[PDB]
Amino acid sequence: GFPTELKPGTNQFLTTDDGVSAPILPNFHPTPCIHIPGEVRNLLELCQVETILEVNNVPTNATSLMERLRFPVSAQAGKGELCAVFRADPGRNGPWQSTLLGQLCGYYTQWSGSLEVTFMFTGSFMATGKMLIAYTPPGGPLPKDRATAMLGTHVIWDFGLQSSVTLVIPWISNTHYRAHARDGVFDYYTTGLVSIWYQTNYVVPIGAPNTAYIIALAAAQKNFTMKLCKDASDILQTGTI
Amino acid sequence: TINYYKDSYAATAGKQSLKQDPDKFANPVK
Amino acid sequence: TINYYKDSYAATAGKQSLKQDPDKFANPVK
Amino acid sequence: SDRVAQLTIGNSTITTQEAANIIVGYGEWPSYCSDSDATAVDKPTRPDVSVNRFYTLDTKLWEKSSKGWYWKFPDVLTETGVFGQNAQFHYLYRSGFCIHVQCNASKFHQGALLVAVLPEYVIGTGADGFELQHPYVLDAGIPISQLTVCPHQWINLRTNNCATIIVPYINALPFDSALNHCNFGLLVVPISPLDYDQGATPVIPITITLAPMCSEFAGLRQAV
Amino acid sequence: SDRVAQLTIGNSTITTQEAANIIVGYGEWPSYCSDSDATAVDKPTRPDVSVNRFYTLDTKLWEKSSKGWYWKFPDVLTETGVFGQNAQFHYLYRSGFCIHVQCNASKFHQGALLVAVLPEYVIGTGADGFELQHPYVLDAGIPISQLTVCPHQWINLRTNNCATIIVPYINALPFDSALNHCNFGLLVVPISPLDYDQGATPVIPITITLAPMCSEFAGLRQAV
Amino acid sequence: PAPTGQDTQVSSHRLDTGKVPALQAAEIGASSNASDESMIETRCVLNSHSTAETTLDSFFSRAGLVGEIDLPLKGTTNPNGYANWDIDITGYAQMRRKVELFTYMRFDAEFTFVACTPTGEVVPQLLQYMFVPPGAPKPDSRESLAWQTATNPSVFVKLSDPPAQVSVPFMSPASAYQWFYDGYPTFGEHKQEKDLEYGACPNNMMGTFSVRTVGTSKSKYPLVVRIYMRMKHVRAWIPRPMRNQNYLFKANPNYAGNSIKPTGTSRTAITTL
Amino acid sequence: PAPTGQDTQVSSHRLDTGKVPALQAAEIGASSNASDESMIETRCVLNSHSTAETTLDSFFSRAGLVGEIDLPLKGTTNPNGYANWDIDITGYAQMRRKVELFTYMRFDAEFTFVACTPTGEVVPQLLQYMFVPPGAPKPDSRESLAWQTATNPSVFVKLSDPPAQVSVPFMSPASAYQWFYDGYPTFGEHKQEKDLEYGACPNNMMGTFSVRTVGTSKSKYPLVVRIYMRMKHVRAWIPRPMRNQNYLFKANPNYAGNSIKPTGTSRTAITTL
Numbered sequence A: 001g002f003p004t005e006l007k008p009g010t011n012q013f014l015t016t017d018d019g020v021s022a023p024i025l026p027n028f029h030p031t032p033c034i035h036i037p038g039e040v041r042n043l044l045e046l047c048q049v050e051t052i053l054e055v056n057n058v059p060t061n062a063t064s065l066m067e068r069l070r071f072p073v074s075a076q077a078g079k080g081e082l083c084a085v086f087r088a089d090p091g092r093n094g095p096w097q098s099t100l101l102g103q104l105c106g107y108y109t110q111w112s113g114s115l116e117v118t119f120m121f122t123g124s125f126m127a128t129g130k131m132l133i134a135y136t137p138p139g140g141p142l143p144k145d146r147a148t149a150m151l152g153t154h155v156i157w158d159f160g161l162q163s164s165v166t167l168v169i170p171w172i173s174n175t176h177y178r179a180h181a182r183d184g185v186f187d188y189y190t191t192g193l194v195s196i197w198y199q200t201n202y203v204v205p206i207g208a209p210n211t212a213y214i215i216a217l218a219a220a221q222k223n224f225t226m227k228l229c230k231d232a233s234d235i236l237q238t239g240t241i
Numbered sequence B, C: 001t002i003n004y005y006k007d008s009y010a011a012t013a014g015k016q017s018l019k020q021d022p023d024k025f026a027n028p029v030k
Numbered sequence D, E: 001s002d003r004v005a006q007l008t009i010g011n012s013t014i015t016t017q018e019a020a021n022i023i024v025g026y027g028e029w030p031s032y033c034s035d036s037d038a039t040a041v042d043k044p045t046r047p048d049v050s051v052n053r054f055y056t057l058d059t060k061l062w063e064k065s066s067k068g069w070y071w072k073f074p075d076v077l078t079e080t081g082v083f084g085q086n087a088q089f090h091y092l093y094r095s096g097f098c099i100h101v102q103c104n105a106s107k108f109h110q111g112a113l114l115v116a117v118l119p120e121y122v123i124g125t126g127a128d129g130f131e132l133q134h135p136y137v138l139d140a141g142i143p144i145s146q147l148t149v150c151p152h153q154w155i156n157l158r159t160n161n162c163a164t165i166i167v168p169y170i171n172a173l174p175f176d177s178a179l180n181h182c183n184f185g186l187l188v189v190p191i192s193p194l195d196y197d198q199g200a201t202p203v204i205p206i207t208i209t210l211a212p213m214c215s216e217f218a219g220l221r222q223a224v
Numbered sequence F, G: 001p002a003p004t005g006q007d008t009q010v011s012s013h014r015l016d017t018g019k020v021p022a023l024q025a026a027e028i029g030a031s032s033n034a035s036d037e038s039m040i041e042t043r044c045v046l047n048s049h050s051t052a053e054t055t056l057d058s059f060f061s062r063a064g065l066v067g068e069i070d071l072p073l074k075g076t077t078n079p080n081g082y083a084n085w086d087i088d089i090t091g092y093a094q095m096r097r098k099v100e101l102f103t104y105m106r107f108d109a110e111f112t113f114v115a116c117t118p119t120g121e122v123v124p125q126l127l128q129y130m131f132v133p134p135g136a137p138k139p140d141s142r143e144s145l146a147w148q149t150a151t152n153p154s155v156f157v158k159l160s161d162p163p164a165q166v167s168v169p170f171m172s173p174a175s176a177y178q179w180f181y182d183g184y185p186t187f188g189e190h191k192q193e194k195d196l197e198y199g200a201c202p203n204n205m206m207g208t209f210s211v212r213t214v215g216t217s218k219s220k221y222p223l224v225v226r227i228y229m230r231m232k233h234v235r236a237w238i239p240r241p242m243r244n245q246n247y248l249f250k251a252n253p254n255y256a257g258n259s260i261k262p263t264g265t266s267r268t269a270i271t272t273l
């Protein structure tokens, strides 16, 4: 018949290949598909939904595992005290590991885009105060005081009727994409740091609680993209199931 | 899609259509 | 039907035509 | 303008003066089964006014050390009202739901709740609801921090005192039985614990109200 | 052509091969309450298929010395089916009725029945019916010979074996309660006594079947 | 449409009262809407990054292990040269965690079977893979009469040949597969025994997989078969939060209650990295 | 035409005398005509279920076992390395029950031969399958002169190669094959001996199948050959009731008279499930 030749790529089973195979059921018609609400057409559609961030990931015991979702705030001596810090690296293990964005990003090697962190105040109605949230780009170490942190991009948050403010972390980088950061050589892709400072005080009249809590929600902007699919770093089994 | 048989479910995956509706889950407010 | 030879009986089964005459066996009444 | 609200359906009415708008689940209002989706051959019954109204279920107390509660739908209403009677007299059932959660306190209290709806809530190891044992993992091995991906709202005691969610019919079949399948479960978890100083009122009840919308039944038989 | 008959409504069907046509009570088919007749302000519920179907009540035996039986409407159905459940969950009620009486025997039996409907049957001195004590005066001081002025039919064992009557809503009010007022009563009296010779089957049961038509309910409350 | 990421428009400083993009009310339940060009001073950037790698087909059309069958010479599992395996996907964690992100899926499949000796060596031997739909006669031995495969699909292949593969349609009576089923499959009273059927969805039981070595007497080599699965024409609905703790049983969300662990890593203090 | 199932039209209640869809007279011999929309109250349903899987081609175009040949080293069946097998389909129950639903069939065929050792191992060996039409010289040994296959079709193949397959036309002198023949094939007197030819239809005897191992001396391995058959371009006529009892002999409807069994299962009482 027709003379052919075989190239040195035959008989190999490649997992990611797209190929044609012989069907097992000739002339088969599946069940019709009715309309079911809530269809996903892209993993990026649900990469922009805010989820609770675990900034206060100090405790570990079983009975206090719920305390990791908020961090406390109270009255001080008005000297610009520090509240909490963390690293703004979605793929690196840390506070971001508790969000849907953090879990999904583990399936993709490289990402690019702007993030967004929202803080909500859950105190009494008569408690007022202001806070400063600062984002230090790469190169600068952790700020030692407020007057050093105010140099980078920052936003001043005022308590009031509107109880939520959003700090947008703009995409500032040297490369078009960033790989996942880790300790050692791969610190080249570190995004920076986030700090929260007392602005004036936490003022409260008589007969009202002295301690309040803040809840932080994180998500991604409209230019967030990921590529180069890989497998996750965590396996949820310890043998046969 | 490339197909060599009489059944449509034996073809390749092909290229989908790039459409997004982020407002379905992020902004469901009336 | 797909054929590669000179004989029609070596081809594939192909797709038939969907026709039914249920009245031949169920309602044969004159 | 989205601070006062009135919701009326059937012969019941709900008013609130501190609202947080209305969340429509997955951006789709409830509707009836179209002629192309149907599979039954018998004409269904639509009682309309007699089963689409607000029902009040039970009251649960909020304490400084509470864990959380969850309910199941439509298991709660099978012994309540004409909706209950029709559910046991018919085999196929479909409907939507409008859910309203009420919890109010003074200006000197503080705390926050997480109201969410999770379809097909399989629980690992009635109308009064149950109390969670391991709220961190939702009693099913999934973290609670990602619950916001589901239709949800918050009850912040300094901002509002109510939450409203509208959920259409969610299932892979046009009709299903109401006595063997629970489409979704409602969750109410205190994320920020309640706090107040001695002398204030220490009872902060939580009450649940809900109303079926666009109900349908088919397959009449004896009551089971 | 008026010898075979099939009546279907809802999800039940009745067939008979020896009929005596159909009597429409007072020459008016049942209908709904017009907008000018209504007095309520709340929209009523019309379950339609779930309450308009044939129900079988009970069986009574015909003996050579029987007196007669009578039933009351709609008192019989208040504990049966979705019609019963809706009756106790609502205050106002209206509907029509289609009534079918069955009694069959062989060719060697003889006897005749008088099936009639008498509105507002006040009795002088449930679903199983009662037995008359003085059938000549209808237990109310009126002669039975003039009963034919009411919608009626006959069951002659040599001609037919069934009787059909269609009765609209009869009352002076557009709506009324189903637990305190009985619109009409059905009467079945043997005028010509049953007779047969020894050796034939001596059991000649009588069974009653009926079906509400164009029902309506209003005034929802708790079940009473 | 969304073929690429969004651009960034030039912005300047703004000092005006009444319009506040920054302040929000997260109690409503909707994500933010403030953008980069509304809280800092930005430039013009023309984004041309493709978003075609994050589609459902691009994320699920990759092969993964779902099955394992052992045919030993001496042992207790399958010493007769035949095996029966019920079709389940929940047997392995990597694929299960991926597929459990959603609630309803509708897809075709492409199955690939790789066979070799336990040591990895390849020997000349013949087999027969038989697909047994629910309600069909299941074989009980190596020479069972049901192996005539008069109607059920079957495949004959040798070890020395490249691994065999077939294409599979969507065979569910429902409109989609569901990995979670909050209910029971029977109208019973659910006293205690039915609780072992909690979540057992009959719409997911697709059949049985049967394998044997074609022959009358016992073979001469121990054999192992590995089943790999790939998805195509995928649709998904209603995403749910991802898994946190370890898996214990197939088709069960059970977890070890005594050993509960946080989602991520931990540090010593909140004011120190 | 009937590409999909029928729909259902909206119906309402009817109370009128003279027209009775429900009552029937089955003594006539025709099936019913009352539909759903004429005995209960129905809604509008748009049916779109395909009926393409129930066609004759869709039901018969599946391979099945019909033959078995043994070529042992030591034994009494075929110790000379050659075998003769008359072409018959009635040798196995699964295919026979399927094909016996009808009386006349007309179809082509696709035959596939699978060969291996009795233990399932594959060894390098050469064979020759020869089709012997009726009236041709049948071989009697391994080195028979008739193996020159001057006119008869023949196939040379090795065990290590994929199984060989051929396409087969319709070779009957009649207009169709018949699995039942109520009569005798000769004009004789039918005293007793002819009764062994009762039902023997000459129109179904299509020939002989011959197999040998190409060589002069005896081979070194025992071999087994399996013949699989698949139908295409199928036409059928005059369906008949399906088989009930076990099979006893090829091309014979004989059954065990002492052990007669009901078609289905049995219960204790008629008023209890």
Ligand SMILES: CCCCCCCCCCCCC/C=C\[C@H](O)[C@H](N)CO
Residues within 6 Å of the ligand: A024, F087, F088, F089, F090, F109, F111, F129, F130, F131, F153, F154, F155, F166, F168, F177, F179, F204, F205, F206, F209, F251
């Ligand atoms: C040569 C025959 C082999 C073909 C056998 C495979 C066909 C059937 C595969 C089913 C596809 C996956 C869907 C199955 C159901 C669910 O995954 C699980 N039961 C989860 O409960």
Ligand SMILES: CCCCCCCCCCCCC/C=C\[C@H](O)[C@H](N)CO
Residues within 6 Å of the ligand: G087, G088, G089, G090, G109, G111, G129, G130, G131, G153, G154, G155, G166, G168, G177, G179, G204, G205, G206, G209, G251
């Ligand atoms: C390479 C040569 C092999 C080809 C040999 C097969 C060709 C003939 C097959 C006949 C097809 C089936 C029809 C035969 C007749 C009936 O099935 C039986 N005799 C029933 O009595």
